[PDB]
Each structure stands twice: as structure tokens, then as C-alpha cells.
Subunit: 369 residues, 3 copies
């Protein structure tokens, strides 16, 4: 009769897939950069041609942190004894010795530079990514007609990253936590992707930058995880008689199985006749509206319990199917089963919820008399 919460320990294994480490522009300063991810530490640095390299951060000589070193030429120089390591992981020079042991080779991670971002491939099995597991090129990025990224990040301590992934099915929380108003909500999972289609409006009683200065903006969203960690969200807003195109990133990487970094950011297509500056300000506003919602999630996650047996209502999204899909990335590729990857679609009938949320928004308006 009393329902109890069940929760297994978070896996120690990290998701197999592409993970965005951040913006190319932040990494292309010619300095080394430290990334604590997947239970270890990595070093990111640009070579003299500007290509980004990602190595295990721990120097194979005496364990020094390469990310606290310095770039010299096309090699990263260790701060402890200045050995030089290139983008292939090869030690290219021990500056105080004649020869280099041939076995001096560390791990260079597989990278992708795309969409103004740096992605790395994680796989505990150690295989390269298949050609068909990739990150889509966002068509508009880098054209004159779109802004650069307004980009933000948040460090979440005390939660496993499944907590963020669960949101792809959580229609109700976009009302309570993101202060939007969902009207249509549909999920489709298939292969290594998970998609949410939503149509929402702003709420009258709460003001958010995501509405682009129209409290009743309709927003059409197609949001897809391409693998375990990286979502692209294509949005179109009808705000004050205009149609605005926004592309929002929602992504993360695990620091450990109890800590992750959440990065999110927006580009906006320049409306006819608006300057670069005005468009950049629309991107920034949209990103700040997203921030508000994510900071609320952070408070939810900070205080909540993990739960493997959530009790779902009739108006809930397909959490269990999402989780079964997500599990593919935590088993060897050989152990993947059809029920993880088979096409699964579910649409929530929102008519109940909309009735209720309208009453709520209305009597929160009456709340001025």
C-alpha cells in the first residue's frame, strides 16, 4: 500500500557517444584548457594551424597535468619537465634528452569541430565512431543570416546526467518550471536519437525572454538528442506578427557519475532589415529566458531523490521508454536490444492539462485586484 522509491546506484560506466566540450572560439586562444570529464581529465589545445587537439591530461612521464602546461608549436608542453606531446598523442621532444622512447605515446581523443563547437567521442570499448553516429551540421551556422552563439553553462553537483535527459518527455514541467504553456506534445525515439515535438505559448502571468517580447508568442519546437548527450532544438516563434527562427543547443558532459556540466546556447536568424547587433540581442535574450528555466531545474535536481520506479499519470510522457532508449549508450554495442532502438512514438493528449493551466494562469491574473 505505501509506495516506496527504488533507485539503483548510478552507473560507473559513462555514455558512449559524442559530447560537446564547448565553443571553438573559447578553445582557440592558443592556451591549454582543462576538462574534467568521464571520470578523468583532458587537455584541449590548438596547434599552430589552429586545429584543436584533445589528449588525456596526465603526462605519461611522471603524471603531470598537461592542461597546466603551455603550447609550443604543435605540441603541448608539460609543466613538470616540459616534455612535448602532439595531437596524435606522440611525444615529440624531451627537451633535455637526445632521444625519445618510441613507446612514449598517450591517448589522443577523437574530435569533431562543427557548428562552432568542439565535440569528443567517448567509448569505453575503445572503438571509433561509426560514420552514421554523428552530429548534424546546422545549416545556418556561420552564414551572414544567423548570429553567433549566445552560450551559457552550469555545473550540476549531486545528480547523474539522466536527470537532464528525462526532461525530453516531461511536458508538465515546461509549465511549472519553464513557465511556458504546452499545447501539443509528442515524442519519437529511434536508433540513437530521441525527439520531442512541442507547440507552446508564453504564460500571461509570467514573463520570459523565450517569448521575444510578446507574452502570447506561439512557439513550435523540434528537439532531438543525437546520441546520449547533445540536443539540437529548432524553434520557430510567432511573436508580434513576425516569424523568428532560433536554434537552441541543450547538451552536457559527465564530470563523474554524480556531477555534470550543462551547456546551452542560441543562434537566431537575422530578421529582414535588422542589424547584427539587434539579432545578437535577440539570441542573448532567448538564452537568458532558457537560463531561468534551467536554474529552476537545478533547484529541482539539487533537492530531489533519484527514482527508478516513477509513478506516472495519464498525462505523463513515456519516461520508461526514454530510459530504455537511453540505456543503449551504457551497454556494449553488441548487447544492444531491438527494444532500446525500435521506433517508439507517443503523443500526450494535453486537453485536460490545458484547461487546468488556463484556470491557474487566469486566477493568477485576477491576483492584482
Amino acid at each position: 500500500e505505501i509506495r516506496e522509491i527504488q533507485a539503483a546506484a548510478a552507473p560507473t560506466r559513462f555514455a558512449r557517444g559524442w559530447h560537446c566540450l564547448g565553443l571553438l572560439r573559447d578553445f582557440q586562444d592558443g592556451k591549454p584548457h582543462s576538462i574534467e570529464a568521464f571520470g578523468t581529465k583532458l587537455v584541449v589545445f590548438a596547434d599552430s594551424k589552429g586545429q584543436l587537439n584533445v589528449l588525456d591530461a596526465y603526462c605519461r612521464h611522471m603524471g603531470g597535468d598537461l592542461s597546466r602546461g603551455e603550447v609550443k608549436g604543435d605540441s603541448i608542453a608539460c609543466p613538470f619537465h616540459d616534455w612535448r606531446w602532439n595531437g596524435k598523442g606522440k611525444c615529440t621532444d624531451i627537451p633535455y634528452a637526445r632521444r625519445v622512447p618510441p613507446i612514449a605515446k598517450t591517448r589522443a581523443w577523437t574530435t569533431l569541430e562543427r557548428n562552432g563547437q568542439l565535440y569528443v567521442w567517448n567509448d569505453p570499448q575503445g572503438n571509433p565512431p561509426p560514420e552514421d553516429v554523428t552530429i548534424p551540421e546546422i545549416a545556418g551556422y556561420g552564414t551572414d543570416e544567423w548570429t553567433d552563439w549566445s552560450w551559457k553553462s552550469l555545473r550540476i553537483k549531486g545528480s547523474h546526467c539522466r536527470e537532464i535527459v528525462d526532461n525530453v518527455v516531461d511536458m508538465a514541467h515546461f509549465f511549472y518550471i519553464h513557465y511556458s504553456f504546452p499545447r501539443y506534445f509528442k515524442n519519437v525515439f529511434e536508433g540513437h536519437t530521441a525527439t520531442q515535438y512541442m507547440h507552446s505559448t508564453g504564460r500571461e502571468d509570467v514573463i520570459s525572454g523565450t517569448n521575444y517580447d510578446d507574452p502570447n508568442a506561439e512557439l513550435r519546437s523540434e528537439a532531438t538528442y543525437f546520441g546520449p548527450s547533445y540536443m539540437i532544438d529548432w524553434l520557430e516563434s510567432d511573436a508580434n506578427g513576425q516569424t523568428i527562427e532560433t536554434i537552441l543547443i541543450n547538451c552536457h558532459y559527465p564530470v563523474s557519475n554524480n556531477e555534470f556540466v550543462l551547456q546551452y546556447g542560441a543562434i537566431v536568424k537575422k530578421l529582414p532589415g535588422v542589424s547584427d547587433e539587434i539579432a545578437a540581442g535577440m539570441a542573448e535574450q532567448f538564452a537568458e529566458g532558457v537560463q531561468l528555466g534551467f536554474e529552476q531545474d537545478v533547484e529541482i535536481w539539487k533537492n530531489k531523490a533519484p527514482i527508478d520506479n516513477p509513478l506516472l499519470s495519464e498525462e505523463d510522457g513515456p519516461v520508461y521508454q526514454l530510459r530504455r532508449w537511453y540505456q543503449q549508450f551504457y551497454v556494449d554495442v553488441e548487447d544492444i536490444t531491438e527494444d532500446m532502438t525500435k521506433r517508439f512514438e507517443f503523443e500526450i493528449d494535453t486537453t485536460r492539462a490545458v484547461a487546468s493551466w488556463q484556470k491557474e494562469v487566469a486566477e493568477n491574473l485576477a491576483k492584482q485586484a
Copy 2:
């Protein structure tokens, strides 16, 4: 020849019994309140009639912290998706859905409202409290002739709560740590209670509010634990020719097996002809004198080792019998043995100690010339 300290790991099991969570007045503000106890988290809230309810804090939908929610009607509303939970643990409404799953029932803890306090019943076996395991009604509380509580609390990190319980037999430390002067000291353990009878005086060399502005006040104390965690101490002071009646609470709850909350507080009987205000100031002073002693204990506990094999002198209280009594609350009721619960009495002959403490207080007086 070298004596070594032995100490088993602190139990993971929490004491079976009534635990005071705090003052009703603090909980009856219509807001939810978070309590981290017994290795979990609880939510306390008043319904619309003012009755207090205590539930598991973790929402059975998706794990949300109910204690960061809001009270609506007679239900607590989860901050994540606003499901409503009543005092019986029943989900009364999913505001955006037509129906509620019948299996939506969480744990409502058994409570007691008494003595201006809220108590909850803990039992890992999951049974209700027997009729004869209860908290005494303090006769004077809530009458015109007694004050309300002057109440204080302290959070102790890095100790198991047995450390506070041990004090019920520790005559000597009331001199060194509490700066009183014990003259008579007797213990009686029986059933689920443990009692200390003491007569003490203030020390000349040290000034304390517990002496009510008479450095030589005699104090008669009857102090009893009613179960594992909650002590009521009935005190009568003869200070400046008056007889003052005080009732002191000393209680705690375990946060984890290495952290606990200590709450203590006093009511004073109004002397003939004194105002409510004057009496409240006597309660506050008494509570501040107790605080001094407890803050010293905190320093003792912060730095000490746990010890299962204490080496006792002739003037020590019956630590081992106290601990055997205390063990009853950490075994199933079926496994309780007669030697835990049998009447056991021991009186310390204080004549040695008094001689010594007088010399000490005297030569600390001479300490002005």
C-alpha cells in the same frame, strides 16, 4: 599493558522511538518545512485546520522535494509538477490530469502534538507505537502560571547521538563542562526510561544563568529519557531565598549516524507577583546558561574519539549499564533481553569529588590576589 581504544562502527540502524522535531509554533506558519532525519528527508506542514502532517519528503511521481513545495488546502503541493499529497500520504489531485492512480500513496509518519512540540515515531520495523511508549504531558505547559518555551538548537557533525545520551551518567562533567557542582548523583534505568537524579550548587568561581543570579543556588534535578532521544528535566532552584520551578527539555534527532540535531529549551513557573515578561526572562536566562554547557560539550565531541571500552573510575556513573539499556532501541522488539530493561540503580558516593572540587574552586578564588 598499554590500554587501547576500541570502537565499532556506528550503527546504520536508527533508534526506535519518539523524536521531537521542534516547536509547534515554528511549524504552524502554513509553510512546508524540511527535516533531514533518520537518513532521509521529511516534510512537515499544517493543513487548513492547523493540524501538523509529516510525510516522506520525496514525491513518488519523479522524486521531487515536497518540502520545497507549497501548502494548498490540506495537501502539500510538489514543486516539480504540483501533485498534491495529504496528511494520510494520499495523492489527492494531479492538477493537469483527470484521474489519480489509486496506488499513489506515500508514507505519512505517526505524529504527536504535545507540550508545544511535534514528535514523530521512528521504527525500522514499521510498527505503530505501543500505547505505553509515549511522551508525558508536562502539567504546567500551556497554563497561565508557566511561560512558553525559550528554545535553542545546535547541529552536531561528526558524532553519533550516543555521545549526548552518555551524559545522563556523567557526574564529573557537570563540574568541568557545565560549571555546576554536583553533591548527590543517582541513576535509575528501567523499561524504556533512563533517569538521573542530581543535587548541585553553582560554583563561586564561575557564573552561569542556570543559577538564577545566586552564585550558590542549590538545584534539585530529576532528568529522564522517555525512550532513546527525548529527556524532560524537572528542576527546582533555591536562589536568593526563593523556590524556582523550571522544566528543561534535552532532546535530539539523528540526521545520519554521524550527525544529529540537539534541541533544548526551558519553561519557568511564574513566581507569585511576577509578570509574564519577567518570567520569560528567567526562562531565557536559564536556557542561555544551558547553552554555555552544551557549547562546551560540542567542543568535547568535536575533538574526541568514540570509545566502546571506556576505562571507569570509582567515581564514574554506570556507562556500561546505560549503554546496554540504550541498545534496546537498536534491536528488534523481539530481540530485547531482560538485562537491557531490568531495573538498575546506582548512586555515586560524591564525598571524594566534592572535597577536591572545593579545593579547586577555592584556589581559583584566591586567584585574584
Copy 3:
């Protein structure tokens, strides 16, 4: 092909040997002093004749921290109930009782007062130190012709103390981390000692107090660990036509197997015709130059990985032989093998490294045009 880092968990066992706890002058204030070492806590205090005593800090009565007590006579008085413990570990008085249980005896550690320092003997097997395992008397210490110690300390969190010991063979890091310029480098390990002989010069491009105000000072160093934790370094500098004699301590004690205290300090022989004050200022300057290098090591250690399989170059010192020697102190004396203790000598041919470091220092000079 990819080389991986291997690292076993740090031992839980602590090194057998003499460990310096600090300066006698700091301990001879008549107050008790707390030392967290070897996974436990110790109390240091002077008796009424000024002799230092070291006991287990945890009182055998009820676990009180003796190091937060007070010295009375030749005994330390516990802060909880004022029992008195002498330098032999014997309880000498329970001030409020007639008798003391004969079995009231705690652990007095074996100490040495020498070189203005206090050393204690650690051995998990519980044996006394053999006559031939000792700390050398530094001839000059306490004579008119030498200063007292300029002494410094650093607390290192998140590293095992093997990290500091490894430096005895690490020629290259004296250039990159200590900003000296090694010209000759030789190790000899034998018995319970490990020695580094080095000749170095200052670097032009970097200024350090260790050069005594001559940027090209030659320095001759004989540095020896006498057991696992304590190194004496005899130095002679030829700076601005003078010959300066310095003796530098480099030592530590383990707090836990992941935290240690590093203490280091210098005495200087008074040059003909210089005052005590001028000599003390040379000691202080030398100590501050050492500090600079050690603070850099702290940054190296803070960020590095532990590594049991370091990959060594032709110009590396004999790390593996050093570690095998060091292992003697973590096995029972009976289990020591000849390969740990046999004489082993290795000299690095520095000619390669010197060429390279000169180029580097030179083009860092050109770095002003």
C-alpha cells in the same frame, strides 16, 4: 601502443621511521599541542623540567582530546574530566577519586630531541628503534657560529608522501620547478638512506634567494634521507667571491595516506665578521628561495596523477630503484629484501640537458629586446 597510467591505491600502512614533528622552541611554551599524524592524533607537551612528551591524544577514560587540555605539573590534564597523564603514559591522578585503576596506561611515543627539533618514532610493528636507525647530530647547530632555524611548513592535501620522496632523483625538475641549473647529479641508496649529490648554478633569467644575491652562484649539495621522511641537505655556495655554508632540512609527516605536512628550514654559518642579525637574514632569504620551489611543487602535486609505471628518459634519475629502497619502510623488518637495501649508485650525464637549458635561458634573456 597507447601507453596507460597504472597506479595502485596508496598504502594504508605508514612508514616505519623517525619523523620530525617540528621545532622544540614551538613546543616548549608549556601548552599542549595537537598533531594529526599516522592516521591518528597525538599530543605534545613539556613537563615542568621542559622535557617534551608525546602521547596518543585520545584519553582512555571517555575518549577526550588531551591536546585540548592543559599541562599541570608533569602531566597533561584532559579537558573532559581532568584526568592527568604523564610522559610515560601513566594516569597519575583522577582528581575527584581516591584511587587510579592500575590498568590506566596509554601510549607514550618514543621521542628524540636533537638539532632543535622533535622527532618521534613510528613503527606499526611496535618495536623500538634500533640504535643504528637515528638522526645525525648536525655539528654546527646550537654553536655561536651558526644561526637558529628559519623554518617553514606547508600542508599538502590529496597526495601520498612518496610524491616528495621521488624528488631526490628528479634532476630536471630543479631546473623547471626550482629555477636552479643542475650541472652534476648523482644518487646513492644504501641501507636506510638515500642520497642526492648535485652541483647547480642559479639561472640568469630567474632570480631566487637560494643564490644569495649572486645570479650565477655555484652550489654544491649533499642531500640525504635518514629513513623514510627526514632529509638533511648540506650546502656550500660560492656567491660574490664568498663561500657560504647552509644546512637545509626537508622533511615531512603523513597525516593520512592522502595528506602530509612538509616542513623545511635553514641554518647558515655566520661569515667572518657578520652579525647574528645579518646571518639570520641570509637563512631567511635561503628559506624563502626554497619556499618558492616547494610552492611550485605543491601546484604540480595538486593537479598530477599518481603513477606507478612512469616512463623514463635517458636523462631521468633512478625512480624505480628509489621506490624499491623506499618500500623497505612499508614492509615488516623481517620481509626486507637485499634489493631494497643494497648499495645502488647512478649518475646522470647532464651534458645534453645543460646544452638545452643554456639555449633556453639565453633566448629567455634575448626576451627583453
